[PDB]
XYZ file of C-alpha atoms in Angstrom:
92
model
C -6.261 17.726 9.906
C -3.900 16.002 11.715
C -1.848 17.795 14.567
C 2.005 16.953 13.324
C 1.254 17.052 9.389
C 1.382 19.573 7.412
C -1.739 20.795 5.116
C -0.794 19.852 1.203
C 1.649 17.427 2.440
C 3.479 15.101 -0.942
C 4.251 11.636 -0.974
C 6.358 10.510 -3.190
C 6.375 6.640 -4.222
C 8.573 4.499 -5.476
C 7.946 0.870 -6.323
C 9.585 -2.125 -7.106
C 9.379 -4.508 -10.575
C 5.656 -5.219 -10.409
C 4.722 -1.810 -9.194
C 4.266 -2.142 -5.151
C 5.000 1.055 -3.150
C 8.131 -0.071 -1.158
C 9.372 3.330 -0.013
C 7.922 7.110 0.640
C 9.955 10.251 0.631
C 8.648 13.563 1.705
C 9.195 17.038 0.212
C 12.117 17.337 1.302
C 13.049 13.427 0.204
C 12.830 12.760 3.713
C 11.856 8.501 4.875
C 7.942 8.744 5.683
C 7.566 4.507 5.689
C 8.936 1.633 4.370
C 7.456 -1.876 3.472
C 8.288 -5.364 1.795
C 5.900 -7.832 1.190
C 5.674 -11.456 0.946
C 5.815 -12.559 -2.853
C 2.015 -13.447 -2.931
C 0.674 -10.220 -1.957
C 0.961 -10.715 2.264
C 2.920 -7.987 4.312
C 5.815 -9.082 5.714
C 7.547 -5.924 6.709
C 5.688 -2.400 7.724
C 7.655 0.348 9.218
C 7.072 4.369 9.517
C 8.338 7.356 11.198
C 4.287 7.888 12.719
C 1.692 6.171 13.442
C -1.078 8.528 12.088
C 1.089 9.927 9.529
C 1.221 5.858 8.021
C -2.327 5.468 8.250
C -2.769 7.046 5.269
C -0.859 5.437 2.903
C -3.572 3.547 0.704
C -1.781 1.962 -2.252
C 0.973 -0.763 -1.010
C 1.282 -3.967 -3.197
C 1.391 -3.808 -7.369
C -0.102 -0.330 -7.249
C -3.306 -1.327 -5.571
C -4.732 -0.418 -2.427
C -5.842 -2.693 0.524
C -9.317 -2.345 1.821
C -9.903 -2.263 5.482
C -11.142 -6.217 5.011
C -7.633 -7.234 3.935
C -8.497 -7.725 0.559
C -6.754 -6.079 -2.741
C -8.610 -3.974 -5.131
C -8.372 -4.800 -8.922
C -11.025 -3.341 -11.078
C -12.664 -6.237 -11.992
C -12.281 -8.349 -9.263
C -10.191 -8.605 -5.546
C -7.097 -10.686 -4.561
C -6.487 -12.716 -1.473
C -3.127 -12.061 -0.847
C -3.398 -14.917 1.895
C -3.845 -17.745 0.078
C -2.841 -16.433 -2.719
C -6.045 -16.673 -5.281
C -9.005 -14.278 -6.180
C -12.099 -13.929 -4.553
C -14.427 -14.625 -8.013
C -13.774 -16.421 -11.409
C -12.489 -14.411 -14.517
C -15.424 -12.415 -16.197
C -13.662 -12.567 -19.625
């Protein structure tokens, strides 16, 4: 466990239109990190009361979460948010 977090800790999320996790509020509704990103999936803004505590926030953009290679996690396929296109074709 972490040395300034508390065990059972909540993190409450709440997102914009298409479902990104701009904000995060602590029990207590307290600001744990905030975030904007550019409209094609880059981050463009990244900002946190800790550094460890931030670390662990795994979902960002439309409700997905960013894998430690920089791509976006789907389902069914992953998202460049770079340039801006997927990694495969459509399956369907």
């Amino acid at each position: 466990k972490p040395e300034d977090i508390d065990n059972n800790q909540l993190r409450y999320s709440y997102d914009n239109l298409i479902g990104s996790s701009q904000l995060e509020l602590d029990s207590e509704g307290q600001i744990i990190s905030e975030e904007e990103y550019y409209p094609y999936g880059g981050t463009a803004l990244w900002a946190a009361r800790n550094q460890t505590e931030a670390s662990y926030k795994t979902i960002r953009y439309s409700g997905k979460e960013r894998d430690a290679t920089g791509l976006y996690y789907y389902g069914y396929r992953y998202y460049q948010p770079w340039i801006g296109r997927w990694l495969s074709s459509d399956p369907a």
